[PDB]
Amino acid sequence: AKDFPANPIEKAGYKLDFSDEFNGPTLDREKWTDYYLPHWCKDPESAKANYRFENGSLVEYITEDQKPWCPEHDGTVRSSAIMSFDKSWIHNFSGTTDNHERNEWRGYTTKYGYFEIRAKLSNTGGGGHQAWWMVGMQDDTNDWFNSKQTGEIDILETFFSKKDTWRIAAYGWNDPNFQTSWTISEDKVPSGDPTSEYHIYAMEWTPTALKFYYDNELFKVIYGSPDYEMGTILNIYTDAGSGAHNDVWPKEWAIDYMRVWKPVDGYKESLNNYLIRNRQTGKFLYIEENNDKVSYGDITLKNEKNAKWSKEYRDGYTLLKNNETGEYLNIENQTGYIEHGKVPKTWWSAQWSEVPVDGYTRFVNRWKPNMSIHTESYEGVLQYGNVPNTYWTSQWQLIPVE
Ligand SMILES: [Ca+2]
């Protein structure tokens, strides 16, 4: 009774583009191959997955006597994987020149959409992890070293030893235009027990961003996204960077389904304006003439124009711009209050991390990463300070408006 209920197959405003309901008892070979990156391995039979279907789920598993998947490149790492493609040169994590030629096959490769699995994670504990991830298909050159279409998104990479987390990561590899340094988090999930229950994990990948959802609620945002087709890998590991195996076998997890939907009206390629409302007070942010602070209050016809905001992005951080004044919110002079001015976009004091919480948004400064935007003194003006994530005076709603 503690599983999160499966979502419906039909999603309002979307069309289903791909699904595997994983009922078994055989893997659908029109969608998946059961070898892990076999082009890296002189003998690809080592890279074959072990798996079964149980209770409507794919159960990938590693046995105690399973051999390493590709000892000449990855040492004694063990993994059982399926992939939605089979293609030369893909995901050269070792930077080897030793590719083994494959006849290109694409079970499912796509650019953009709403991607979702429902899964119950390994309960073995000890070293190891499971992963749902996507890699660029390198369609530009069909090699590695000259490709710039090599992005990696680890939608789920949760470690067996960290039972209350959801690990999410991304890196562009050879791509100069996506996530050129690793970003990795493993925040605690807001509810539930991922290793004893089914939960829903999803990513919406648009031209603008990657947005990650846990049981249908926003959990993480990465601004910036790959702009080419990507393939999917679902796998489980032990004896890898996530740690040496403990003595509980097999290492296994269960995936109920994978679904991908496409928006009926497509995605925006990039003009949005926002009102910004405080969770605790219900008041809106605006800039008053001849006031060096940022005000909050009820929406009125008098302040409406001054209550509209734009977002801009730099280094993956958010800048907040008042539409009427053209000024950025910043903390350069460290006064305890949010300032507004036409300051350089390169100032870290004007750049903010967006942190989803409980259906709302916190803004955390880049220059001073302990400082969030809040109104905990309720002084009629906007503050920054170190206050807990659970304080509603630090939680904000960005509301799109004309
Ligand atoms: Ca199923």
Side-chain angles (χ1 to χ4, degrees), residues 253-267 270-277:
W253 68 320
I255 308 139
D256 179 24
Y257 64 76
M258 176 184 159
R259 295 179 193 153
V260 187
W261 294 266
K262 297 276 188 166
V264 295
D265 293 320
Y267 291 119
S270 174
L271 286 185
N272 283 14
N273 300 321
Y274 302 89
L275 298 173
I276 303 175
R277 189 184 208 187

Tab-separated table of all heavy atoms in Angstrom, residues 253-277, unseen atoms left out:
chain	number	residue	atom	x	y	z
A	253	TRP	N	17.291	-4.683	-9.106
A	253	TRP	CA	16.205	-3.707	-8.978
A	253	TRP	C	15.089	-4.016	-9.944
A	253	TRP	O	15.221	-4.908	-10.794
A	253	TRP	CB	16.688	-2.261	-9.157
A	253	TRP	CG	17.179	-1.826	-10.547
A	253	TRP	CD1	17.949	-2.539	-11.448
A	253	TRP	CD2	16.966	-0.549	-11.140
A	253	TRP	NE1	18.205	-1.770	-12.567
A	253	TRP	CE2	17.617	-0.543	-12.399
A	253	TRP	CE3	16.282	0.608	-10.734
A	253	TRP	CZ2	17.614	0.579	-13.244
A	253	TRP	CZ3	16.268	1.715	-11.574
A	253	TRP	CH2	16.936	1.696	-12.814
A	254	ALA	N	13.976	-3.290	-9.816
A	254	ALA	CA	12.781	-3.631	-10.574
A	254	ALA	C	12.216	-2.399	-11.255
A	254	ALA	O	12.014	-1.373	-10.602
A	254	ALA	CB	11.711	-4.266	-9.652
A	255	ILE	N	11.995	-2.493	-12.564
A	255	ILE	CA	11.401	-1.381	-13.313
A	255	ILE	C	10.036	-1.796	-13.868
A	255	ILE	O	9.953	-2.690	-14.703
A	255	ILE	CB	12.329	-0.932	-14.460
A	255	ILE	CG1	13.747	-0.654	-13.927
A	255	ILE	CG2	11.778	0.326	-15.153
A	255	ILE	CD1	14.828	-1.158	-14.849
A	256	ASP	N	8.982	-1.105	-13.428
A	256	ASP	CA	7.606	-1.440	-13.814
A	256	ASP	C	7.315	-1.044	-15.260
A	256	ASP	O	6.684	-1.803	-16.015
A	256	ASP	CB	6.626	-0.771	-12.832
A	256	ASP	CG	5.166	-1.043	-13.162
A	256	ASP	OD1	4.780	-2.041	-13.816
A	256	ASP	OD2	4.329	-0.212	-12.734
A	257	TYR	N	7.770	0.144	-15.654
A	257	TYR	CA	7.562	0.637	-17.009
A	257	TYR	C	8.512	1.779	-17.310
A	257	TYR	O	9.064	2.397	-16.386
A	257	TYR	CB	6.112	1.120	-17.247
A	257	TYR	CG	5.642	2.324	-16.417
A	257	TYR	CD1	6.051	3.636	-16.730
A	257	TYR	CD2	4.710	2.157	-15.380
A	257	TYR	CE1	5.617	4.726	-15.981
A	257	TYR	CE2	4.249	3.254	-14.639
A	257	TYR	CZ	4.694	4.521	-14.948
A	257	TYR	OH	4.235	5.583	-14.211
A	258	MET	N	8.695	2.038	-18.603
A	258	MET	CA	9.313	3.263	-19.107
A	258	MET	C	8.379	3.846	-20.166
A	258	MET	O	7.916	3.127	-21.052
A	258	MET	CB	10.684	2.980	-19.739
A	258	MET	CG	11.320	4.231	-20.377
A	258	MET	SD	12.883	3.832	-21.201
A	258	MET	CE	13.032	5.215	-22.333
A	259	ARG	N	8.099	5.142	-20.067
A	259	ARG	CA	7.226	5.817	-21.020
A	259	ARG	C	7.856	7.141	-21.411
A	259	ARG	O	8.491	7.813	-20.584
A	259	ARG	CB	5.838	6.061	-20.399
A	259	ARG	CG	5.074	4.764	-20.081
A	259	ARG	CD	3.706	4.981	-19.429
A	259	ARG	NE	3.179	3.734	-18.875
A	259	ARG	CZ	2.333	3.666	-17.848
A	259	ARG	NH1	1.881	4.779	-17.262
A	259	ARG	NH2	1.915	2.476	-17.412
A	260	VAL	N	7.684	7.515	-22.673
A	260	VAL	CA	8.112	8.833	-23.137
A	260	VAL	C	6.974	9.495	-23.898
A	260	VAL	O	6.412	8.902	-24.835
A	260	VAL	CB	9.337	8.752	-24.073
A	260	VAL	CG1	9.845	10.152	-24.393
A	260	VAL	CG2	10.478	7.893	-23.436
A	261	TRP	N	6.637	10.719	-23.497
A	261	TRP	CA	5.582	11.472	-24.159
A	261	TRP	C	6.151	12.718	-24.837
A	261	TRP	O	7.201	13.239	-24.439
A	261	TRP	CB	4.538	11.932	-23.141
A	261	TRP	CG	3.721	10.882	-22.443
A	261	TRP	CD1	2.480	10.418	-22.822
A	261	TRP	CD2	4.005	10.273	-21.182
A	261	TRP	NE1	2.002	9.530	-21.888
A	261	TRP	CE2	2.920	9.414	-20.873
A	261	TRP	CE3	5.078	10.347	-20.282
A	261	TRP	CZ2	2.880	8.634	-19.700
A	261	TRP	CZ3	5.044	9.566	-19.124
A	261	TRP	CH2	3.942	8.729	-18.837
A	262	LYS	N	5.454	13.191	-25.870
A	262	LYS	CA	5.839	14.416	-26.573
A	262	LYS	C	4.679	15.400	-26.443
A	262	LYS	O	3.525	14.987	-26.523
A	262	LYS	CB	6.092	14.136	-28.053
A	262	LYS	CG	7.267	13.175	-28.325
A	262	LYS	CD	8.596	13.913	-28.325
A	262	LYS	CE	9.746	12.994	-28.794
A	262	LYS	NZ	10.962	13.811	-29.101
A	263	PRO	N	4.970	16.678	-26.231
A	263	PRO	CA	3.906	17.675	-26.081
A	263	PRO	C	3.131	17.826	-27.396
A	263	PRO	O	3.740	17.855	-28.474
A	263	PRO	CB	4.678	18.950	-25.717
A	263	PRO	CG	6.017	18.754	-26.293
A	263	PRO	CD	6.311	17.281	-26.088
A	264	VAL	N	1.806	17.898	-27.325
A	264	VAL	CA	1.035	18.030	-28.567
A	264	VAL	C	1.420	19.292	-29.350
A	264	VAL	O	1.477	19.267	-30.589
A	264	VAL	CB	-0.492	17.964	-28.336
A	264	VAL	CG1	-0.896	16.585	-27.830
A	264	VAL	CG2	-0.951	19.058	-27.376
A	265	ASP	N	1.738	20.371	-28.632
A	265	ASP	CA	2.022	21.650	-29.282
A	265	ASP	C	3.516	21.967	-29.405
A	265	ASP	O	3.900	23.087	-29.771
A	265	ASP	CB	1.278	22.780	-28.556
A	265	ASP	CG	-0.241	22.680	-28.709
A	265	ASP	OD1	-0.728	22.348	-29.817
A	265	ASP	OD2	-1.037	22.918	-27.768
A	266	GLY	N	4.357	20.981	-29.109
A	266	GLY	CA	5.796	21.188	-29.131
A	266	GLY	C	6.277	22.017	-27.954
A	266	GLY	O	5.483	22.473	-27.123
A	267	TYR	N	7.592	22.197	-27.877
A	267	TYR	CA	8.199	23.021	-26.850
A	267	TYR	C	8.634	24.349	-27.446
A	267	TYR	O	8.923	24.432	-28.639
A	267	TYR	CB	9.441	22.321	-26.289
A	267	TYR	CG	9.158	21.081	-25.467
A	267	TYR	CD1	9.655	19.831	-25.861
A	267	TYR	CD2	8.422	21.162	-24.280
A	267	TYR	CE1	9.414	18.682	-25.102
A	267	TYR	CE2	8.174	20.013	-23.511
A	267	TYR	CZ	8.678	18.787	-23.930
A	267	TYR	OH	8.420	17.667	-23.163
A	268	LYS	N	8.691	25.375	-26.602
A	268	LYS	CA	9.260	26.673	-26.971
A	268	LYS	C	10.763	26.514	-27.204
A	268	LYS	O	11.435	25.817	-26.448
A	268	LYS	CB	9.027	27.688	-25.848
A	268	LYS	CG	7.578	28.144	-25.690
A	269	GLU	N	11.290	27.153	-28.247
A	269	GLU	CA	12.728	27.095	-28.502
A	269	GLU	C	13.498	27.946	-27.488
A	269	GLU	O	14.680	27.717	-27.251
A	269	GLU	CB	13.058	27.529	-29.936
A	270	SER	N	12.822	28.931	-26.900
A	270	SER	CA	13.413	29.767	-25.855
A	270	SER	C	12.352	30.232	-24.849
A	270	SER	O	11.244	30.621	-25.251
A	270	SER	CB	14.117	30.977	-26.473
A	270	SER	OG	14.578	31.869	-25.464
A	271	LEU	N	11.306	35.096	-23.540
A	271	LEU	CA	10.298	36.158	-23.633
A	271	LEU	C	9.267	36.084	-22.490
A	271	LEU	O	8.426	36.985	-22.351
A	271	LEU	CB	9.577	36.111	-24.995
A	271	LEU	CG	10.273	36.589	-26.288
A	271	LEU	CD1	9.293	36.556	-27.476
A	271	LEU	CD2	10.918	37.970	-26.147
A	272	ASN	N	9.336	35.018	-21.687
A	272	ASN	CA	8.430	34.816	-20.545
A	272	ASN	C	8.546	35.924	-19.509
A	272	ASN	O	9.650	36.402	-19.224
A	272	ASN	CB	8.733	33.483	-19.854
A	272	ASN	CG	8.189	32.278	-20.616
A	272	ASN	OD1	7.794	32.375	-21.789
A	272	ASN	ND2	8.181	31.122	-19.951
A	273	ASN	N	7.405	36.315	-18.935
A	273	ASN	CA	7.391	37.242	-17.817
A	273	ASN	C	6.760	36.519	-16.630
A	273	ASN	O	5.966	35.585	-16.831
A	273	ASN	CB	6.604	38.508	-18.167
A	273	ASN	CG	7.187	39.249	-19.356
A	273	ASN	OD1	8.405	39.345	-19.495
A	273	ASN	ND2	6.322	39.752	-20.232
A	274	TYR	N	7.134	36.925	-15.420
A	274	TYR	CA	6.655	36.255	-14.201
A	274	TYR	C	6.259	37.236	-13.116
A	274	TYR	O	6.918	38.273	-12.918
A	274	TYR	CB	7.749	35.363	-13.611
A	274	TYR	CG	8.246	34.306	-14.543
A	274	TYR	CD1	9.314	34.569	-15.410
A	274	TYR	CD2	7.674	33.025	-14.547
A	274	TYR	CE1	9.785	33.585	-16.291
A	274	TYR	CE2	8.143	32.024	-15.433
A	274	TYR	CZ	9.196	32.324	-16.294
A	274	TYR	OH	9.669	31.365	-17.164
A	275	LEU	N	5.201	36.885	-12.378
A	275	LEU	CA	4.975	37.486	-11.060
A	275	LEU	C	5.717	36.573	-10.087
A	275	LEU	O	5.944	35.398	-10.402
A	275	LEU	CB	3.482	37.502	-10.711
A	275	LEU	CG	2.565	38.309	-11.632
A	275	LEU	CD1	1.104	38.088	-11.248
A	275	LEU	CD2	2.938	39.794	-11.556
A	276	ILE	N	6.114	37.101	-8.928
A	276	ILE	CA	6.818	36.300	-7.918
A	276	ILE	C	6.124	36.487	-6.574
A	276	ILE	O	6.115	37.587	-6.024
A	276	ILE	CB	8.315	36.716	-7.814
A	276	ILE	CG1	9.015	36.587	-9.177
A	276	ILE	CG2	9.035	35.822	-6.796
A	276	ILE	CD1	10.481	37.099	-9.187
A	277	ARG	N	5.549	35.408	-6.064
A	277	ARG	CA	4.714	35.471	-4.870
A	277	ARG	C	5.340	34.702	-3.704
A	277	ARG	O	5.825	33.576	-3.887
A	277	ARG	CB	3.343	34.881	-5.194
A	277	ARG	CG	2.289	35.071	-4.086
A	277	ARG	CD	0.944	34.388	-4.394
A	277	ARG	NE	-0.133	35.122	-3.724
A	277	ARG	CZ	-1.412	34.745	-3.651
A	277	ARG	NH1	-1.836	33.615	-4.218
A	277	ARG	NH2	-2.273	35.509	-2.993
